[PDB]
RNA sequence: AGGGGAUCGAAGAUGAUCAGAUACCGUCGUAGUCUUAACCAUAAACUAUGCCGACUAGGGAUCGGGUGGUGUUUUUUUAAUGACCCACUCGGCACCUUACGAGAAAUCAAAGUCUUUGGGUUCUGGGGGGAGUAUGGUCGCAAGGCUGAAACUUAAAGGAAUUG
């Protein structure tokens, strides 16, 4: 159908999002250390659950 | 097995030719041809009444064995045998079902007529089909009286009769009633007939 | 407190029947879900799907959920239950019952050497529930349940250690898949192997043995 | 037209063992059938059969005994290496434990366990279980 | 799906038949088909035989009847309700009403 | 169904039907258990001792559940002249 | 028009079954019975019910109407259903046989008086 | 029956009818007719480097609505004209 | 459109392409 | 092409109808409709269901053949023949019911005997469009038949049944 639309606004949203810098933080371990760190996490200590165990919830329900 | 008293004795055989149970339907059926001795001209059939009696005794033999004679449901919907399965119910344990069968009986427990027999006896499989169907969902042996064009489906031992009216159904019901009493029960010394009139298992209107 | 209303049910609350296959031997229509409730507790349950369906009423629309549940242990006994109803909770419940009122006997066996504890099936069996036709094949030890995650978990409760599967048909309608993966393992008791060629004398049916303690008042 | 003989036969046996029947007629009686019936009789999947002399081709009556799931024929009578026998019994037999795929070698029509043991092979005939 | 096991009407073991014409539509329906009613009546109808059998000579006499045989089309049979749309079970009945 | 050490596994051994020898399935609820009592010293049926024939749902839906009984009755002698092998 | 509802007719099938001796053909007395063996929350229903029970009575005592059974009728129908004549079986002049039925006996083992038809 | 012939001497009829039917199979024809080597704008090769001609603001299909930002490219190795899509936000401004 | 007047159309469309073609033999 | 040319009737005209009405309805009528001698090769040319074979289930009709029948009805005397009846057996056009079985289902005595997959054998089809198009070939006086693509395009198209 129609083929010359308006180039006038390419890059609109990215060029108008407030730039944010990454908050630095101490690096995560690499290799076995991370995978170990993962192991004790998901099923050794156990944190937040719903009967179903929830991986990435933020502010939860409360 | 069954000695020699259990043979014929043409006083029994007199009842049969008297109730007319010997007369067999014109429209035969392949599962009923052994019971046909011969066919009378002018369109008729003749039941091999020996086998009728032979099965009858076999019939009674099945009615026994089963313990509590009460929950051995004798059924009819046809009016002609209704009064008969009431008298049979009266004598033997035999819980009766006269009139409509009301679907849901053997299956479906909640109901007001949840019988759980261990044997069933039926007058006419055509008109009583709903009993026979429903039985077949719950492992329940089935006795029944069968003319020649009667559905052998889902039935077991079949007594061959006439079920076209008159005295056929009561007699075979009366006789069943007799030998269920000779065997175990309270008759013994089968050589003599019965203190009970036959013409009691019959119809009304009057 | 359970109260039985069927002959079968009285005998089992009694103690007069100790095992389940007693009923399967005599083709006894289990009606009260309490029976298998008691003839085999520890029986594990898994819900598999809760999918919605619809309908139009003499006005607008109609909507409700549909629960599909398997019940079983892992020692030859499994059932399938599907029941759709107004709520998710009531759906699950109502169906578990339905699965248990239909648990089936499984004939496990050997693939080759009979070297201690059956691992796979007697023979090949194959079910069908319209289009979708599931067929199970014996498998050497250590093999595993090779099937859809759905049928895996269903044979898991069925108690199969190794088996191969061959799904044909629209396996995406999950319902008719399981049912025929059910129809399959239940068929196993119907394949006349020569082991069973040898005749037994036919038992007596506890409905006539305990016929006294069997009837009502 | 008739194109196998063993075929209609083993189909009649197969069909009738389903409808509950305990006997079955067969037309027409050919040697090949007989040996196939001989294989089947010995392993106990039918009973005794009876030839019939009509100076013609023949008839057979075979007694059935339950425990016949299928008696198949495999057409055309494939050439079966002696190693490739495994790949047939794998395909069309219900478990390693039992079942029989009767072949047809120059040593004679026989089952596969037998040829298994004689170390001979040939052309697959059919199969029984 | 097939909405009639007789397809149209009664051919079977043929594959063609002569055509009849509707008496209303003047259609061409295959004779095998066609709703087909026999119209017998009376020359004088019911109400007039009194003034008829009065004013007429002869001893009483033998009333004639007009004989006609109507062939219709499904189109004109249905509208003029010679035949009428019935249920899926009911349609099966071939017995006269 | 045996095994390694001649030990007997497999839940139950299903019943076999008496007119077709074909197993009676666990849910063969059209199958029938026919208990026929015996007769001692003239009449007087014996409770407790039966002649029990088994039949499967198939044979009884087919309609041979009678012909098969009469045949299986004369088999253990309970009838005479009824079933005629020759037709 | 006037069609009484099930809640009424349910109540009439019950009182007639449970209280056939004490019911009667009159509307007035039953109304008083009802204030005894029953708790009816409104006078009209009280009257309407008793009206229907009494309707049945005027056709109960004239025939055993369809779906109701009580004691003194069940005991009434058990007697009447025991009539036994001097019999018809009997035979008042031997057994009338057509044919082949005769041959049925001849080839069975039996006496019996006969006839050819 | 089963439609096909089952003869032991018929491999000819069998091996050829399957050939004479692989042609209804799409991606088989495309391989045997080399459409890829023929009418495809690339050569069959996974990539092709062309020159950018005019730029196009191609509207999107239904039921969407946006300006898709593309380029008409002169593939060097064929001279074939080909319109191609530029991805991510504002990348249209990186190509000239 | 109905597939019988669609059939008609493709025949007029062919009779007309036999024409424009042999416009130069 | 010749005959034929009642009739009905594509075209066409003319009357109404309609907002328009090339139409439905009404009137007039060409061709055609019939035949002969040529062609043409297509229809939902349908059972939308290849053919020979074997098998698995009951029931009453009906066509053609034959057989059995101290059956019937026919004369002037009850015999031949004629029709008719009963049973039957082959081979028909089907119907009826069942369902063991099969199917996505409607439904099928085949569309059954198929994941327990092999009796013999011909043919077709492999997403919807593009398109029965383009192009070559060939048959046809012609109309057209027969053979028959591709680029590009697109995520549904489509069956059966369910409730609205
Ligand atoms: Mg399929
Ligand atoms: Mg037609
Ligand atoms: Mg035609
Ligand atoms: Mg494509
Ligand atoms: Mg451009
Ligand atoms: Mg068309
Ligand atoms: Mg056209
Ligand atoms: Mg015009
Ligand atoms: Mg025009
Ligand atoms: Mg010419
Ligand atoms: Mg043409
Ligand atoms: Mg065509
Ligand atoms: Mg076609
Ligand atoms: Mg048939
Ligand atoms: Mg015909
Ligand atoms: Mg044209
Ligand atoms: Mg979309
Ligand atoms: Mg279509
Ligand atoms: Mg549709
Ligand atoms: Mg609808
Ligand atoms: Zn018309």
From TrEMBL, chain G:
Presence of the UniProt keyword Manganese in the record: no
SUPFAM superfamilies given in the database record: Rps17e-like
One Gene Ontology biological process: ribosomal small subunit assembly
One cellular component term from this protein's GO annotations in UniProt: ribonucleoprotein complex
Keyword presence, Cell membrane: no
UniProtKB keywords: Ribonucleoprotein, Ribosomal protein
Recorded superkingdom: Eukaryota
One Gene Ontology molecular-function label: structural constituent of ribosome
InterPro entries: Ribosomal_eS17, Ribosomal_eS17_CS, Ribosomal_eS17_sf
Family stated for the protein in its record: Belongs to the eukaryotic ribosomal protein eS17 family.
Annotated protein name in UniProt: ES17
Lineage: Eukaryota, Fungi, Dikarya, Ascomycota, Saccharomycotina
């Amino acid at each position: 159908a129609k083929v010359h639309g308006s180039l006038a606004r390419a890059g609109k949203v990215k060029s108008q999002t407030p730039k944010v810098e990454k908050t630095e933080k101490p690096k995560k371990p690499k290799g076995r250390a991370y995978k170990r760190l993962l192991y004790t996490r998901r099923f050794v200590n156990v944190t937040l659950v719903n009967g179903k165990r929830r991986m990435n919830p933020g502010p939860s329900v409360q | 097995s069954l000695p020699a008293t259990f043979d014929l004795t043409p006083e029994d055989a007199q009842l049969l030719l008297a109730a007319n149970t010997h007369l067999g339907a014109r429209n035969v059926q392949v599962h009923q041809e052994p019971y046909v001795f011969n066919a009378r001209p002018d369109g008729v059939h003749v039941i091999n009444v020996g086998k009728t009696w032979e099965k009858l005794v076999l019939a009674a033999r099945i009615i026994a064995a089963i313990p509590n004679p009460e929950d051995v449901v004798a059924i009819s919907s046809r009016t002609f045998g209704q009064r008969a399965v009431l008298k049979f119910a009266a004598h033997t344990g035999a819980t009766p079902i006269a009139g409509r069968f009301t679907p849901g009986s053997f299956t479906n427990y909640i109901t007001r007529s949840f019988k759980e027999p261990r044997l069933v006896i039926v007058t006419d499989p055509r008109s009583d089909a709903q009993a026979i169907k429903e039985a077949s969902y719950v492992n329940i042996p089935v006795i029944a009286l069968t003319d020649l064009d009667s559905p052998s489906e889902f039935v077991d031992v079949a007594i061959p009769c006439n079920n076209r009216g008159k005295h056929s159904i009561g007699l075979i019901w009366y006789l069943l009633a007799r030998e269920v009493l000779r065997l175990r029960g309270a008759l013994v010394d089968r050589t003599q007939p019965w203190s009970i009139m036959p013409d009691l298992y019959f119809y009304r209107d009057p | 407190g359970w109260v039985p209303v069927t002959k079968l049910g009285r005998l089992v609350k009694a103690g007069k029947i100790t095992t389940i296959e007693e009923i399967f031997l005599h083709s006894l229509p289990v009606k009260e879900f309490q029976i298998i409730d008691t003839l085999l507790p520890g029986l594990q349950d898994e819900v598999m799907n809760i999918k919605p369906v619809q309908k139009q009423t003499r006005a607008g629309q109609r909507t409700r959920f549909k629960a599909v549940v398997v019940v079983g242990d892992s020692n030859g006994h499994v059932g399938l239950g599907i029941k759709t109803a107004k709520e998710v909770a009531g759906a699950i419940r109502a169906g578990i019952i339905i699965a248990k009122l239909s648990v089936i006997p499984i004939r496990r066996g050997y693939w080759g050497t009979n070297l201690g504890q059956p691992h796979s099936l007697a023979t090949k069996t194959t079910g069908k529930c319209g289009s979708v036709t599931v067929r199970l094949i014996p498998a050497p030890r250590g093999s595993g349940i090779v099937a859809s995650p759905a049928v895996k978990k269903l044979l898991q409760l069925a108690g199969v250690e190794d088996v191969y599967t061959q799904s044909n048909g629209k396996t995406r309608t999950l319902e008719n898949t399981l049912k025929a993966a059910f129809v399959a393992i239940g068929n196993t008791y119907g394949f006349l192997t020569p082991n069973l060629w040898a005749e037994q004398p036919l038992p007596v049916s506890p409905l006539d043995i305990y016929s006294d303690e069997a009837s009502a008042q | 037209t008739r194109s196998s003989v063993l075929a209609d036969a083993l189909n009649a046996i197969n069909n009738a063992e389903k409808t509950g029947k305990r006997q079955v007629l067969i037309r027409p009686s050919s040697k090949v059938i007989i040996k196939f019936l001989q294989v089947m009789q010995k392993h106990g999947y039918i009973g005794e059969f009876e030839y019939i002399d009509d100076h013609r081709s023949g008839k057979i009556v075979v007694q059935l005994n339950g425990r016949l799931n299928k008696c198949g024929v495999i057409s055309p009578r494939f050439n079966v290496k002696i190693g490739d026998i495994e790949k047939w019994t794998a395909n069309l037999l219900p478990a390693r434990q039992f079942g029989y795929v009767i072949l047809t070698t120059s040593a004679g029509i026989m089952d596969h366990e037998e040829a298994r043991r004689k170390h001979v092979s040939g052309k697959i005939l059919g199969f029984v279980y | 799906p097939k909405k009639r096991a007789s397809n149209g009407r009664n051919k079977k073991g043929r594959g063609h038949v002569k055509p009849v014409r509707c008496v209303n539509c003047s259609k061409s329906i295959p004779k095998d088909k066609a709703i087909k009613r026999m119209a017998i009546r009376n020359i004088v109808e019911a109400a007039a035989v009194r003034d008829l059998s009065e004013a007429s000579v002869y001893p009483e006499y033998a009333l004639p009847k007009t004989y006609n045989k109507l062939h219709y089309c499904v189109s004109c049979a249905i509208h003029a309700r010679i035949v009428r749309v019935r249920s899926r079970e009911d349609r099966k009945n071939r017995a006269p009403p | 169904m045996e095994n390694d050490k001649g030990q007997l596994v497999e839940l139950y051994v299903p019943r076999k039907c008496s007119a077709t020898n074909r197993i009676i399935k666990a849910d063969d609820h059209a199958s029938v258990q026919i208990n026929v009592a015996k007769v001692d010293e003239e009449g007087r049926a014996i409770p407790g001792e039966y002649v029990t024939y088994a039949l499967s749902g198939y044979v009884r839906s087919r309609g041979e559940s009678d012909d098969s009984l009469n045949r299986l009755a004369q088999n253990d002698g309970l009838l005479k002249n009824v079933w005629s092998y020759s037709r | 028009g006037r069609v009484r509802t099930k809640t009424v007719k349910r109540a009439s099938k019950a009182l007639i079954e449970r209280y056939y001796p004490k019911l009667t053909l009159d509307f007035q007395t039953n109304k008083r019975l009802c204030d005894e063996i029953a708790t009816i929350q409104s006078k009209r229903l009280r009257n309407k019910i008793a009206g229907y029970t009494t309707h049945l009575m005027k056709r109960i005592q004239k025939g055993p109407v369809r779906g109701i059974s009580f004691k003194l009728q069940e005991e009434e129908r058990e007697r009447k259903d025991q009539y036994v004549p001097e019999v018809s079986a009997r035979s008042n002049g031997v057994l009338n046989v057509d044919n082949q039925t005769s041959d049925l006996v001849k080839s069975l083992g039996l006496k019996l008086p006969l006839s050819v038809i | 029956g089963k439609g096909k012939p089952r003869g032991l001497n018929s491999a000819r009829k069998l091996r050829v009818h399957r050939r004479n039917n692989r042609w209804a199979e799409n991606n088989y024809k495309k391989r045997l007719l080399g459409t890829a080597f023929k009418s495809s704008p690339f050569g069959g090769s996974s990539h092709a480097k062309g020159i950018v001609l005019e730029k196009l603001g191609i509207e999107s299909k239904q039921p969407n609505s946006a300006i898709r930002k593309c380029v008409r490219v002169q593939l060097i190795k064929n001279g074939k004209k080909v319109t191609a899509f530029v991805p991510n936000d504002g990348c249209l401004n990186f190509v000239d | 459109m109905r597939a019988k007047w669609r059939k008609k159309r493709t025949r007029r469309l062919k009779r007309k392409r036999r024409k424009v073609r042999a416009r130069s033999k």
